[PDB]
């Protein structure tokens, strides 16, 4: 009857590293190899009562008493130097290949059927649309999450590191290439073919991606935020902790991977939001909602079950979504 496998673990393609933040001045970014790193430091914040009150704390005496005892805490803060207006963020990306092959599979017949399904996809249309959209999210600085919202000029440089050396160099204007449209461009097409060769398994590709953002002198930059155990004293609370590896502000690799993953424009709801990350049940953390609900028969699992088990191939857009979710990887199958 060819039921689905209980264990369907997949390994991820498109492996990014931690993205390190350094700082410097515009028009000296061609010699940015020795730019000083952005350092996460401590500052003190004093806050008032600015949250909603539950109809019992709205008493004027209680509210004023809460004012007389403000919350004192220290926060991890990352800022550019006062003589530097450009933020440099550098990471390396490795594209593996072999997306349809699971890392663990209970059923051999289901494994073979899934391999035939993915091979039929690649033979019909290869990793060309998906790689083009991944190259688009590389060209624009979407991995530069909050450091791009107010940057005046953003430039992304992507190199192909073959034997430890730049075999091919790309330079992009990350603001001309927006965060909404997946258009066509010759350099975008070349990077798309490179990522396609990586995803197909034709050759080994390693991409060094460097983004420069002209934000301003001494302006705040935004690395990834860590978890606080919340055990110390209230005055030295450490309400905000920033991610660094060796005294250098950094962005988590999975955040970079999530920003590169933002290629899903095929979800049933409208195009007002634009692309979203290719996740099962189309989850967006900021909106707190799930596009591609399982009730709407457009999530990853129902589409994969219809495509593989019972040969109901969906539309080519949903096929792109399914293959991008297999590239994304995850612990599929019933636990």
């Amino acid at each position: 009857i060819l039921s689905t496998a209980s264990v369907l673990a997949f390994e991820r393609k498109l492996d990014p590293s931690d993205a390190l933040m350094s700082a410097g001045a515009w028009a000296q970014r061609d010699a940015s190899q020795e730019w000083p790193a952005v350092t996460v430091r401590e500052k003190s914040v004093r806050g008032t009562i600015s949250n909603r009150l539950k109809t019992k704390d709205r008493d004027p005496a209680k509210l004023d008493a809460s004012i007389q005892s403000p919350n004192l805490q220290t926060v991890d803060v990352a800022n550019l130097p006062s003589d530097a207006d450009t933020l440099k963020v550098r990471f390396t990306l490795r594209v593996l290949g072999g997306a349809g092959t699971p890392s663990a599979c209970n059923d051999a017949a289901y494994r073979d059927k899934l391999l035939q399904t993915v091979a039929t996809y690649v033979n019909d249309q290869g990793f060309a649309e998906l790689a083009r959209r991944y190259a688009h999210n590389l060209a624009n600085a979407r991995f530069l999450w909050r450091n791009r919202v107010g940057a005046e000029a953003v430039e992304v440089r992507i190199n192909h590191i073959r034997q430890g050396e730049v075999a091919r160099a790309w330079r992009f204007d990350a603001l001309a290439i927006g965060l909404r449209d997946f258009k066509a461009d010759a350099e975008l097409d070349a990077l798309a073919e490179l990522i396609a060769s990586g995803l197909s398994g034709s050759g080994h590709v390693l991409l060094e991606v460097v983004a420069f953002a002209r934000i301003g002198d001494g302006q705040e930059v935004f690395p990834s935020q860590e978890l606080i155990l919340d055990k110390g004293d209230k005055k030295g609370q450490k309400s905000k902790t920033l991610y660094s590896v060796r005294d250098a502000a950094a962005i988590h690799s999975q955040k970079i991977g999530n920003a590169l993953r933002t290629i899903d424009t095929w979800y049933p709801d409208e195009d007002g939001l634009g692309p979203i990350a290719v996740e099962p049940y189309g989850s967006v953390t900021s909106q707190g909602k799930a596009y591609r609900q399982p009730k709407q028969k457009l999530d990853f699992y129902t589409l994969l079950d219809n495509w593989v088990l019972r040969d109901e191939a969906p539309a080519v857009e949903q096929q792109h979504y399914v293959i991008a979710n297999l590239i994304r990887g995850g612990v599929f199958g019933e636990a």
Partner: protein, 228 residues
Amino acid sequence: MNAIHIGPFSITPAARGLHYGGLPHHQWTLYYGPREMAIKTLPDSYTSSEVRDEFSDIIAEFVIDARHRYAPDVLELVNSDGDAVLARVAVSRLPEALSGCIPDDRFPYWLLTASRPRLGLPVTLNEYTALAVELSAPPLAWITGLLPGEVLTHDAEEWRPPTSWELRHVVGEGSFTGVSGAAAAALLGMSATNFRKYTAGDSAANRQKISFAAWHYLLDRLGVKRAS
């Protein structure tokens, strides 16, 4: 001696013994299906009751952790202020109209989740009564978290009959419901021998697989699913 079966659990002894102090001993290991839970070296002079009492505490903490892990999510009926809880209902699933909500004064009654980011909608007492009637959770709804989703589905084309081990979650005296097999057969209007044929071990020639309607009516009458 021989293996002790307590519902889904099994206390099997080691084949070869040992001597601790001057007295003979065997290692008794506790299982939950294929999951080994604990091993104890016990004297050969213990009876089955003492061996069972040695693992009763581990079984009890497993039961407590299973009740707290798979407890049904709770909906709360609040006033316009959103502070005073007027009624609490535990539901097997949430209403499909739940969205991010803070109560206003435009509506007197609001139904909200007990989860910290609260989801809700304005509700009347008639609508709240209807939702609580058609969404409530049975008192032993936590046992469904210990069972796979392909035995608890109402879709007959996606349904699989439960195995003997999955039956013993709810049918035995050492099970999570605490009813006997004869009581379970009386609930289904079935002979006790025919129902024992359902929970027969693998070392048996006469084994029967329970049907869709019988299994789901058993779950209804046991207070596990579809009982509100």
